[PDB]
């Protein structure tokens, strides 16, 4: 499959092998992809093809109205025709492919991107929460002008947004774990819990199993069990946030009677629901397209910038007992997790989802 799309006059289209590309840490899937000028409408005019990465607050794109606040934080520039000498560019198998179906008027252009910039990531504040929408957006603008300090018209151009999407393997090492006692008042006796996780990395649409185990030595009851997964995302540009929002949650009757002990594994699976509701939750594309996941978890060098990554997302698994004297106690106990886009003769098709 390969998309395209052209600008208002169909004289100038730009074509992709996918609207995706991963990070894999250490590289990034390049965005290697074509065009196809039409050298008479053109003449004069260069075609250049632009890759920018910035941070924007106050509407949901990188349009005018409405946008109170934008941040600059990648920016690649490529003259597509006639084809710049210094930027040299090894064509992929895809472009050659394609290059021969579509004619001699389709030109390469390809981008690499750098290792420690934020993926793609959005956000629509909740009904009763006072900030915007904002986000990071990848975006690849495909124009055509004699130089790049002229004017360029919306006609001749095209726009299109592609995601950056972070991947990570399964690691190797000890699973996550947490545990806690708890002493109530008039009593030495301990009420113990432990949990842990299969995995520290789960991907969109992977099951979470958590297993609970409890030793409870008092003469209390735990009446029930809560489990649940929830999403921290923090905005560190322009107006400063922090949102918290479950993406998961299991309230079970299991009871836990006084001095007996008790295990069970819990499974839930993080999912965006799909009825797409403006909640403070960090996404990785716009609610409204069907393929939009919840956000990855934003993965932190030692001593990187967090600024500079617009958005910081993180998951926790949390695990309650509610306790059978004043109110209800509450004996819990959290797991970090890592959730993760999973890893990865020519048919056209739309580019826009």
Same mark, same amino acid.
């Given at each position: 499959? /390969? ?5 208002? %006059?169909?004289? #100038? ?26 050298? +008479? ?7 250049? /093809? ?7 607050? $106050? ?89 790049? &300090? ?15 999407? *972070? ?7 000890? *699973? ?17 819990? +432990?949990?842990? !996780? ?7 649409? &992977? ?23 929830? *999403? ?9 946030? *922090? ?36 909640? $403070? ?11 939009? %996941? !919840? ?6 060098? +030692? $001593? ?21 004297? #004043? ?21 056209? +098709?739309?580019?826009?989802?």
């Amino acid at each position: 499959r /390969v998309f395209k799309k052209a600008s208002p %006059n169909g004289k #100038l289209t730009v074509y992709l092998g996918k609207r995706d590309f991963v990070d894999h840490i250490d590289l990034v899937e390049p965005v290697d992809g074509v065009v196809l000028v039409d050298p +008479e409408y053109l003449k004069e005019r260069r075609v250049y /093809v632009t890759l920018t990465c910035a941070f924007r607050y $106050g509407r949901e794109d990188l349009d005018v109205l409405g946008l109170t606040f934008r941040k600059d934080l990648f920016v690649a520039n490529v003259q597509s025709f006639p084809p710049a000498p210094e930027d040299k560019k090894p064509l992929t198998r895809l472009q050659e492919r394609l290059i021969k179906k579509l004619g001699e008027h389709a030109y390469p252009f390809t981008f690499e991107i750098p290792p420690n910039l934020p993926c793609s990531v959005t956000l629509q504040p909740g009904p009763e929460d006072t900030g915007k929408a904002c986000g990071v957006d990848y975006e690849v603008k495909a124009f055509c002008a004699e130089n790049l &300090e002229e004017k360029i018209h919306k006609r001749n151009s095209v726009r299109l947004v592609i995601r950056k999407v *972070q991947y990570a393997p399964e690691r190797p090492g000890p *699973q996550p774990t947490a545990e806690t006692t708890r002493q109530f008042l008039m009593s030495d006796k301990p009420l113990h819990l +432990e949990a842990s !996780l299969d995995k520290e990395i789960y991907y969109h649409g &992977e099951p979470i199993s958590v297993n609970v185990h409890v030793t409870n030595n008092t003469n209390k009851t735990v009446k029930k069990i809560k489990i649940s997964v929830r *999403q921290y995302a923090d905005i560190c540009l322009f107006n400063t946030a *922090q949102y918290k929002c479950p993406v998961a949650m299991e309230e079970a009757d299991d009871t836990v009677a006084p001095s007996s002990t008790f295990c069970k594994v819990y499974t839930l699976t993080p999912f965006l629901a799909n009825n797409r509701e403006k909640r $403070g939750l960090a996404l990785d594309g716009k609610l409204k397209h069907e393929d939009t %996941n !919840l956000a990855s978890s934003t993965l932190l060098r +030692e $001593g990187a910038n967090r600024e500079i990554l617009g958005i910081i997302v993180s998951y926790k698994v949390k695990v309650k007992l509610v306790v059978s004297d #004043l109110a209800s106690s509450d004996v819990a106990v959290e797991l970090p997790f890592t959730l993760m886009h999973p890893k990865p003769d020519i048919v056209f +098709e739309d580019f826009a989802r």
